[PDB]
Every structure is written in C-alpha cells, then in structure tokens.
Amino acid sequence: VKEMPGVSAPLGFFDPLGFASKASPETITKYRESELRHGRTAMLAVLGWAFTEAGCHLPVFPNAGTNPLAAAGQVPFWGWAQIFAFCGVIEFVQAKIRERPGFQAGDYIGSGDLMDEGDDQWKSFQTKELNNGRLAMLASIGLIGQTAIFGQNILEQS
Amino acid sequence: TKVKILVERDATATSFEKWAKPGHFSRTLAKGPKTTTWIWNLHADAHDFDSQTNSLEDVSRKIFSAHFGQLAVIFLWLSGMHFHGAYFSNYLAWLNNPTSIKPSAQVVWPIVGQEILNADVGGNFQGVQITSGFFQLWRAEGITSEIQLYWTAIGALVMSGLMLFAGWFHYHKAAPKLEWFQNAESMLNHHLSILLGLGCLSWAGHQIHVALPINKLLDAGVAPQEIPLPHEFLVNRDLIAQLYPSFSKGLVPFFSGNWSEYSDFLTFKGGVNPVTGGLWLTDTAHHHLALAVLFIFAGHMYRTNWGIGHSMKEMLEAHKGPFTGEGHAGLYEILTTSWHAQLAINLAMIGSLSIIVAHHMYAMPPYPYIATDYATQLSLFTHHVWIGGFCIVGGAAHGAIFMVRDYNPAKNYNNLLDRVIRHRDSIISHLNWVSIFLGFHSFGLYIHNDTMRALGRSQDMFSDTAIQLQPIFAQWIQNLHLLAPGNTAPNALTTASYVFGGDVVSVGSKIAIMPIKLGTADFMVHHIHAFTIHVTALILLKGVLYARSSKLIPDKANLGFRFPCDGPGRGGTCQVSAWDHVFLGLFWMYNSLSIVLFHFSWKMQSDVWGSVTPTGAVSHITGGNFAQSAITINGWLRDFLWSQASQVIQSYGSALSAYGLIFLGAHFIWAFSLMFLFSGRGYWQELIESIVWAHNKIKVAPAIQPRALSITQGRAVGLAHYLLGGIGTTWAFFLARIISV
Amino acid sequence: GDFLVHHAIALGLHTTTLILVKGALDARGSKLMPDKKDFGYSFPCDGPGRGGTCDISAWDAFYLSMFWMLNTIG
Amino acid sequence: PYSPIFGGSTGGWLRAAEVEEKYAITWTSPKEQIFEMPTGGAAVMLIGENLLYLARKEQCLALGTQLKSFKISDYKIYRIFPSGEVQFLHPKDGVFPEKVNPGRLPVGNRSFSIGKNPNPVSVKFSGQGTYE
Amino acid sequence: ASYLPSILVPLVGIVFPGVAMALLFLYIEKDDI
Amino acid sequence: ANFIKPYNNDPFVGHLSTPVTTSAATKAFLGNLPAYRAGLSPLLRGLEVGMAHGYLLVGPFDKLGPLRNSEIALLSGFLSAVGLITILTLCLTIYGKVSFQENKDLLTEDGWSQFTSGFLVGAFGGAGFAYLTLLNL
Amino acid sequence: SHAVKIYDTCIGCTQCVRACPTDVLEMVPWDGCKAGQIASAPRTEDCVGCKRCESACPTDFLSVRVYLGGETTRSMGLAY
C-alpha cells in the first residue's frame, strides 16, 4: 500500500517489478515484515562489522580482532547455537504478538494502541527507520562481498 | 532596540532611621519583640527578599546590590590574604628554596603561650604553616617581590571599596528596572564574550608576557633578585626573544595566519614540568587563549538588538517529542520570572564544577611546587569537595523553594515540569530501588569481607588474592588515555595526566605524581560512592517533587516551604516539608563526601605520595596497604583512622597542638549537636518554664519572654553543629596528618 | 584526676536526675499542656500549635534521660 | 465524559478504591481554566459540570478549598462504595459547616471548662479515658 | 556427648526459628480468634 | 505524537499507558507467562514456575558456595538449592493459608494449594535437571 | 477513630471549622456565647488527628481538644 510508512524518498513509491501491485493485504504485510527484519538485522550487522574492524573485541575473543569473516570461525558451534536460540525466542515472542487482533507490520510496540492519535511525524520516523535500514542492508551485503572478493578487509583500503 | 538600559534615579533614600528599627523589612517582625523567637526570626528572614515584597523589581534590586556586597567582601578577603603574604610571610625565602621552606603567612601574638603555634617553617621565619597554596599561585604569576604583593593588596582594597560603592549606588541612587534584569540573551552574551572570554584573553596575555619568562628564568635557577622586573619584558622585545625566539617575528605571524611560529610558547606537550612538578606554563597559555576564542565566539550566539542571534524562548519551545507532550514550553518564563529556579540551576552547576576542579587539580598539579606540597594538595581537594557538596544541596533546596513558591500550574500545562510531577511516584520508587540495590551489594561486599576475614576464610573474600572484582571498564579507559598521545591526540607529546600511566614524576626526591592502579578495593569504594550519591539524590529529589503535595498532605504548598509538621495525625507527620528533606540530604551529603575524602586521602598516601631514591625505588607513606586493607570495615577503622590519627593525638607540645585542640573541640561540637537533633521542643519549653519561675521569684523577668527554639530552628541548629563538628574533626585530622611532613 | 572524674560523675547523676524528675513532676501537666494527664503517659506530641510540642510527654522525658544514663555509666 | 481534561498521572487512586471507599467531587465551572490536581500537576476544568475521582476525602476537600478560594466555585463531595452505594458527604445540609444552620445538633460537647476533667485514677480499669 | 551439638544447633538456629516464625505468621494474620 | 496516555482511558487512576506498561510486546510477553497464561490449571502454573526457578537456582550455590573449590561442589549446590526450595514452599503454603482464608483462578485456597504442590515438584525437578546437566559438561 | 471534644469556653469564632481539612467540625446554634454558635464534631470518623483545629483556637486553652485513639484507614491518612 502507498499509505504505509517508508514511501517518503526521492524515488517515491518504488515498485518497478509488480510485487505489491495486486498483492493481498496479507502478502504486503509479510513483505513489510521481511523488509523490517532484514533492515534491522543489517543495521546491527554493519555496527558489529564496524566494531570488529576497529579492533574492538570482547576479552573472551582476544586473538581474533582484525577481520570479521575471519573472526566468525573463532566462534564455536555452541555459540552459534545460542545465537540461534536467542533469535528463535525473540521470534516466538513476535509470533505471539502477531496473534493479537490489532497488529501492524513491524509494530511490535503496539503503536496503534499506544499513540493518542495517528500522526504524520510517526510515519516520517518509521520512514527514517526504513531508509536507514535499507541503506544498512545494502551496506552489509556490500561489506561481506568486498571482504570476500578482496581479502584485505575494510579499513585496509578496501 | 528591544534591549535597553532602564533605571530609576534615587530609588531609595539613604538614612539610618531604619538601622534603629530591626525587623523593618518583614511586616510581622516590625511590631517589636514579644518573645525571644522574634530575635531568631530576624536573623532567619533577613535575606528572604521574596517574602518581604510582592514586587519582583524590588527583589531584583536587592539581589543585585547584595551581590555587590558579596563581591566587596571577597575583594576584602583577597586584600587581607595578599597583605599577610607581603608583610607577615616568608614568601621570599620559599621562593629561593621552595622544596625545604614550608609556606606560612600567619603569625600569632605571644599572649598565653600560644606562640608555640609559631612553627619552625624555615627561612629565618616562624609562623603558622598555611595550606591554601597561595605561595604556588603567586609564583605561577611571577611575583618575585613583596612590593608586588603589597600593591596587589592595595588594589584589592580599592576594588572592595568600589564594589561597596557600586552596591550603594545601584540600590539608593540608580536602581535598574525589572525589564533591565529580564535580559537573558544580552546577559549571557556579555558574561560569555567579555567576563569569561576577555578574562581568559587577558590572563593569557599576562602569562605570555609576565608569567612565562619569569617562571622560565626561575626554573633555570636564576635568583629572584637578578630576574628583571615584569615590565622589562614589555619594552625590549629581544629580552624575551632569548627565552622564546618567536617574539623576534612579532605579531605579524598572528595576523598572517602562521600561528605555527608561536609553538615556542604556545605548546601542546601536556604532562607535567619535571623541574617544578606542575603544568607547563606554555600549555596553560595556549589553553587560556583557546578558551578565550571559544568564549568570545559563544558570546555572539544570543539575539540582543540586531536580528542575528538565537532566541532561547523559540529554542526551548522547539524541542518537544512524542514522550514529553509540550516539550520545553514555559521554562524560559520560569527562569526569567523566579530567582529561585535560576539559583537552583546555578548552585547545582557551581557545586559540580567545584568537585570537578577538586578532581582535576590533584591529578594535574597546575602550579609549580604544589604537587610535592602534600599538605596543600589535600587541603585544596577537601575544601573544594566540601564546597561542591554544599552548593549541590543548596541547589536542591532552592529548587524545592521554587516549586513551593514560584511554581504556577496555569503556565506549566503538560510541559516537562508537569509530566515530571505526574510520574514522580515512579521516579522515586525506582530511585529507591536502585539506592537499596547499590547499598545492599556495595556495603555487603565490605561486610562479607569483614565476616570472612574474622572467620579465617580469607580465600572467600572479595580481594585480589580471592574472588576478584576488577574495575575492567576503568582500567580500559586508563589504557586508552595512556595510548592517546600520538594516536588519538597526535599533536600531544604526553598524556593529559600521569595518573592513567607513564613515568613517575618526582621533584626533590618526592613523588609529585605517578600512575594510580585500580584494583578490587577501588571497585568497591567507587560503588560505595555511587550508592551514597544515589541516596542523596533520592532524598533531595523526593523533597523537590513532593514539595507541593503528597498522598499524606494534598495541600502541602499552602503550608509553605519550611514548616515543622502537620500534626500527629495520619500516624505521624514529622519532617514532611521540603526543608526537612534538605535537612536530611545535608546529612547524607556530609556522609558521602566524608567517604570520598577518606578514599582520596588513603589512596594518595598509600599509592601516590611518597619518596624516591636515586635508583628509582618508590616508598609510599603507608607502604601500599590500601589494596589488602581497604576491603573491610575493620581495615578502614584500623589502618586509616586509628593508624593515621596518631599525629593529632600526639600533637600536644608542638606547633600542631592547635590541630589536636580543634580535633577535640570538633568532637565536642559534633556530640553537642545530638542534643538538638534527638530532643524535642516541649521538654525544653517546660524546663524554661521552671527556670522562668526561678527568675521571677527574685523579680528578674525579661520583658522579652524566653522561648525554646522552634522545631525547625532546633533541627537547623542540630544540623549546623553536626556539620561543623564533623568538618572540623576531619579538617584537624587531615591537616595534622599531612603537616607532620 | 579522680577529683575531676568524680565531679563529672556528679554532673552526670544530677543531670539524669534532673531529666527524670522533671518528667515525673510535669507528667500531670505543664503550662504548655495543663491537661497532660488526660493524654496518658506516652503520647507523641500535642501538635505544632502554640510553639510546637515535640517530646512533651513523660515517656519522652524517660527516653531523653536514657541517653544521659548511658553517658554517665560510660 | 464530564471529567476535567487531564493527561493522567501515577498519583491517582489504587486498589483500595476498587475494594474500599472511593470519593468523587462534582462542581460547576463558569469558564475553562487550569487548576492544580491534589495528586498530579495540572488539569483543565470543563465549562459546566466537572466530575472528578479521588482516593481520600482530604484530597477532595483540598481541591474544594482551592476551587473556593481561587475560582469561587461551589462544590459537592460523595463517597462511593464497591457495592454501588453513594453517600453525600461535604455539604451535609446544603450549607457549609462554617455557616450556622438551624437544625444541627451539638456532638462531643462538654458543659465545663477543659480543666475540670476527672483524674485518670478515678476512671481506671473501665474501658474509658478521662475525656469519655 | 560430642555428637549432640551437630544435631541440635541446626535445629535450634534453623528448624526451630523457621517453624516458630511460620506459626507466628499464621496466628498474627489468622483474622479469627 | 503522544505515546503516554492515561491507563484504561481513565485519567484519575494511579497508572499510565507507557510503552513499557501497555505495549503489544509486554502484553503478549506477560500474557504467555505461566502466572498469567490462559487455559492453565493452577497445578500446571506452579509446575512451570518451579521448573523455571529450580534449574535457575543450583548455579549460584554450586559456583559461589563454600565448597565451590572442592570436588563435591555441584552436590552441595544442589542440596542448598533443595533446602531453599523447601523454605520457599513453606512460605507459599503459609501465605496461601493466611491470605485466601474466608481448580479455579490461582487466588483461592485450593487453587493456591495446587499451585504450591506444582511449584515444589517443578522446583525439585529443575534442581535435579540442573544437577544432571552440570554433572557431565 | 480520634475523639474531638468542644468545651463551653468556646467563643464560636468558627476558626476551628475553617482550619479542618477533613470537614469533621461544624457550627451549631447555641446560647451560651455572644456569637450564639458553638463548634461540634458530629463526624469524627473522618478525623485524621492533625490538630489544626487546636492550633486555630483563640481561647486561652483550646476549647476544642483532640485525643488520638484507635486508628483506621481514614484516620491513618492512607490512600491505600
């Protein structure tokens, strides 16, 4: 839908390939959910990539502090298992959210039942989140790509 | 021209008629004394201008002239200090040999044998050793003669006279109108660009032209007699070019933009001067020049008469988000229509700033030969810490006063103040929880360590050789500050302070400053500090928020700012006013600052202050017993209080005997305060009734009937004596412990 | 030394007795509370009226005298 | 509905109001204006009738004093129990207690000076103090 | 003898106070008799 | 916008509908906890709570107890957890017998009794499971 | 609840009634005073014991007196 947040941009509504042109409300809601999940995950991924690149490593990961893709190996299988468990717990919470009648895509704060009235500033700030998230998605995929192709790694003239 | 000068000529007649009518200012006290309570009230409401007139203009004119009077008093105090330095001090002898000569600028008349207090400080001089660091300050200014101190005192006296005359003139002859006072933009521009901007610029000029060359000559070993007078450094440029061969170029680099040519005397080396043990004078000159530039720039931010500038009213109205309703709408009116609000902010900021000064001055000794003067460092730190605490609590009290008196709900609808008042319960409940959590955990660490050490289970304590609580974050910050020179501050040769890391700066075999390592004891004491600060904030914030109303007294505001109670109803309603919250907050602030001062003193004596050998070996005052003894309450009781109290108790028969006498007197006053703190007014009133019967039986009966102190006055007197006793006890303890050296 | 300490002890005994005797004799009423006997032996106060009346009951006299007893025995 | 415009605060009533007596205060405001809540910061009173809820009678009477001494408004106070009962409290007969009202009967009145009360020993072991 | 303290001190300092406080708590707020 | 509005649309109640107090996240998270979940017998609520709090409690005693450095640290920690659980079940029983005195919602004599029995069983289960897990790790 | 008693020394100035925050006191017609009115305490269940009435009394000794007694939710000043 054109009214939902994220639209404000130089491009305006950006749907070259028809995906929301005839999509039922369920499919558009799922598309927005995916966009927000990817965007937030990418924002965190870029921030973590910056943290690792700058040498900022936890005391428990002393040896590996140079290349994030290299650092990924240092994590034992059970560390990744616990990452997955935590993400699954949050996903279970969000699934419990979506059962509530008045759910809007990505509004895990229940803004509809919280705001005194729907506002334009709220839409603009949701758009800010979506835009920084889209940029973070592109930037994170680009970071991984540029570091895989050229092994020198960011901050090393990459 | 919206900003303009408005005054009333001959606002008040000058006469002594009022001086013979005490209590004239207040309507109630003007009727004369019926009982002794009147007397007390006359000294309690003297400066409560807001309660004497309903007009803001009159209160503003009184405040302005009272500030002039305070400036006159401060200038007289400075004049006295400088004059006692010039006529009654060994400043010249200390100049010649600063390390050995002990500063002293006070002499006692021999009248009852008190001349023993005239210590053998040195320099063929006898007097009371001073710990105000005035000698180091004067040396940093390149005084080098007592004529200059004498003229400094004369100028201070003339300035005190001018301040007194200005106060009289601006009350009784030309009193500015209210519209003149309500210029926040113009006032801020003038106080930033000129008072703080040009003040810094002028002091930087002084340092560049006077302090720098004189101190450089002194460090080279030139005797003060052979150092040319400071004015000689302003007439012949070459005479300064020898010291800093960049004047030869003159001021042309400054205007051409080639400021780099001034790096000779405008440096960024940081660290400490190895010779004097203080900060480099060139560093301070560059510092003050940069601050002058910044303050001058910041003084043009606000709009006064020409369109350009910032309107703080619009600025505040603009900042509002979803969570805070109307945002900062109505704060400008609050801060331009009530002196209590402004005083609260200013006192809080001044107190925090004083504490920051205390923390920064010890870590980076700014004056020559102040670092190795252990007595001066400790005195300055503790003095400014106490001043900061008092100012913070005063800011709290005046915030509460504003809330009770100058708060108007009509002009504060759904703004920040309204919302804070509307979730005060949540704020106070959470502050209470965090205070309890901090107290429990932090103090129970000490209790646990004490219990385990008493049970012989040393391996179960929270110590370095036991369960370890390392302040990892503080250590990481210290490491980053250590690595800053060359990487994050590339143009800084040395770290800001040697506390974080580096060499051991020692002057004359005394450790001026060395790195301070943080261990588990530091962790525990820091969390104790946080606990005490949080509790004090709890008390004062609760006093401020619940000053107008509460679930006990829905109409507390009508009762006033300070009142004893609202009767024994609803259970009991003792100490329910905001003034009583300030009364308790003063106790808690005193406790917290006592802990802070003990931490500083013991840590510096055990880990920083000491002596060095030609090889480089370090021997501290207490042998580094802080790590393994500061982790139990018994350790503090034994190794800090009992051990370091030897000097005071054994000071009898020496020049420090005055410190022992004051130690005992402070103990006495502290115990005396408990008489007012514990007891109530009814007992004393009945006792006074019996005593009055005794007087009457002999036809002795004052017309002014005696009365027991009011409840509020009883609490105030108890608190005042409690604070005086505690402060004096620690004052004597520290000064005698740090002057036996 | 024994002389001075004995006079200090006399001070302590006399002051504790002063507190306790004042409490006992004024228990039935004072000019501040002429009807004190009607409020019993132990009551908090009589309110902030007419100057304030904290620690006006006889129980409060005992409570105050306990501090002096401890001090003198010490 | 008739409640004054208020943004809400954490100082309102609590579980005892639901389980024990709650209080209500009604008044009439000629115009719309801001008044200080006994619990929160400030609230706007509607033109015409205003109804407000509280947990203590003292809060209601403090608000009533504010209205009377600032906005010269007459007011009424009621007590509501969980069972639904409503009792009229503050104006007991339509006239304030300060003003004399014929028909009232003295309560707790003693026909002698305060200093003539019996001694505690006289009334001993009976469930009574000297005043009773 | 030399065995009793082990048996009794835990009973007197843990079990006895625990049961005593339980019963006192029950009785204080019994709301009847 | 305005994310803070009176709770339940009642301005005169001592509460606020802040994002922490009344948001889909918190309502759904608390509404699925055993203490508030719908369609649970009080016995099951107690069992869930006990399982959560028993496994949770062995660790502190095991790792920070006086016998932490001995080869029997885990068993001592388990026994301490068991004793504390017994104390808490005593507390629960007395609270139930004092509060609700004159199967259903958890606020009843029988409901609370079933909740306490479930809590004891679940807490002992959690402690035993924590012991089993830590025994080989 | 607290016990509020009014003695015949009262001069019926109404100050005690005005000072009362819980509307415990009131004025009733009387003949033993010049003003023809006397204070009464018909509803002492709402008395909190603040003793404001005593503080606001002109008569030498407190024609209105308050004696604290059994405490209830109302007299204990509890919103809970």
Ligand code: CLA
């Ligand atoms: C402002 C700070 C300050 C302080 C704390 C001191 C403190 C001191 N000075 Mg310094 N002094 C100061 C400023 C100060 N002075 C200034 C500004 C000057 C320059 C004029 C001097 C010049 C100076 C000299 C030249 C000497 C001292 C000396 C002394 C010491 C003895 C003073 C004394 O009791 O003599 C006796 C003082 C009095 C008895 C005071 C007079 C009593 C008056 C009449 C009471 C009137 C009160 C009045 C009724 C109140 C109502 C107001 C009324 C007028 C209407 C003492 C340590 C002496 C010293 O150290 O000797 C070794 C000494 O020789 N001072």
Ligand code: CLA
């Ligand atoms: C840039 C020149 C300069 C120089 C050489 C110094 C030198 C010194 N400063 Mg100063 N200081 C400066 C600028 C400078 N300062 C500025 C601009 C500020 C304002 C924040 C301060 C605030 C400051 C404080 C609060 C304290 C010092 C202290 C010290 C001493 C500590 C020892 C040391 O190595 O300092 C090294 C100094 C630093 C590492 C501080 C550098 C600060 C940078 C330059 C901040 C720049 C802010 C930036 C311009 C913001 C612009 C915003 C605007 C455009 C909107 C030393 C004499 C201490 C002292 O004397 O205690 C006895 C002390 O407590 N300085």
Ligand code: CLA
């Ligand atoms: C900028 C500083 C400043 C200013 C201008 C004021 C101004 C004011 N304050 Mg604020 N206040 C301040 C700082 C300040 N205070 C601080 C730091 C605190 C914290 C303690 C307070 C705490 C405070 C409270 C709690 C109250 C005020 C009140 C007042 C008002 C009346 C003051 C008065 O009549 O003085 C009268 C002055 C005296 C009676 C002198 C007593 C001084 C002390 C007790 C003794 C000093 C001892 C001395 C230093 C050492 C003795 C040595 C010994 C051996 C003899 C006035 C508006 C009162 C008010 O109602 O205002 C509306 C009030 O209730 N203030």
Ligand code: CLA
């Ligand atoms: C040394 C005596 C002492 C002690 C221990 C306390 C303790 C406390 N005060 Mg008090 N206070 C004191 C003196 C003291 N105060 C004095 C002299 C004054 C006069 C000015 C005040 C005035 C005052 C005010 C005005 C306020 C406090 C507050 C507090 C609390 C701070 C939060 C905290 O630490 O909770 C944790 C509790 C402790 C650290 C106490 C020690 C407990 C240890 C660690 C464990 C004990 C063993 C354990 C319980 C074993 C249980 C079994 C056993 C029963 C058999 C706490 C209850 C504040 C408050 O209550 O709000 C938070 C507050 O607002 N106090």
Ligand code: CLA
């Ligand atoms: C008031 C007197 C008194 C006191 C203070 C103590 C104190 C103590 N006894 Mg001893 N004891 C006493 C009388 C007393 N005893 C008598 C008369 C007997 C003969 C039966 C014993 C036989 C005895 C044994 C066999 C042992 C102790 C032990 C102990 C210690 C641990 C407490 C314990 O386990 O109790 C156990 C005590 C009992 C089961 C009997 C009860 C003790 C007296 C009679 C109770 C008095 C109650 C008192 C009047 C107050 C009642 C109010 C109270 C409920 C608040 C402790 C030092 C233990 C020890 O030595 O540990 C190192 C231990 O093993 N006691």
Ligand SMILES: CC1=C(/C=C/C(C)=C/C=C/C(C)=C/C=C/C=C(C)/C=C/C=C(C)/C=C/C2=C(C)CCCC2(C)C)C(C)(C)CCC1
């Ligand atoms: C300590 C004291 C004292 C003394 C002091 C002094 C003596 C001071 C001085 C001071 C000074 C002596 C200052 C000065 C200053 C100056 C300035 C501050 C300047 C400025 C300038 C400027 C700013 C400029 C500008 C410009 C120019 C250059 C020209 C061209 C253009 C322009 C305009 C831009 C006494 C003893 C009294 C007492 C106590 C206190």
Ligand SMILES: CC1=C(/C=C/C(C)=C/C=C/C(C)=C/C=C/C=C(C)/C=C/C=C(C)/C=C/C2=C(C)CCCC2(C)C)C(C)(C)CCC1
């Ligand atoms: C994530 C996280 C978080 C949180 C967390 C938590 C809170 C956790 C918890 C956890 C827990 C709380 C866990 C638990 C577990 C439990 C379990 C696992 C249990 C089990 C049980 C069992 C197994 C049982 C069994 C049994 C029984 C029942 C009885 C007997 C028999 C048997 C043995 C069969 C947060 C977000 C804040 C932050 C970050 C991190």
Ligand SMILES: CC1=C(C/C=C(\C)CCC[C@H](C)CCC[C@H](C)CCCC(C)C)C(=O)c2ccccc2C1=O
């Ligand atoms: C001792 C005491 C009194 C009695 C104290 C009185 C009347 C003070 C007496 C002061 C004398 C008469 C002045 C002289 C005092 C010194 C000799 C020096 C002056 C000290 C300052 C006033 C400058 C109370 O009235 C009281 C009231 C409420 C709580 C506690 C107490 C309380 O503790």
Ligand code: SF4
């Ligand atoms: S004891 Fe004193 S402060 Fe407390 S209620 Fe009574 S008169 Fe008021």
Ligand code: SF4
């Ligand atoms: S205040 Fe005293 S004199 Fe006046 S009406 Fe009340 S009881 Fe009578």
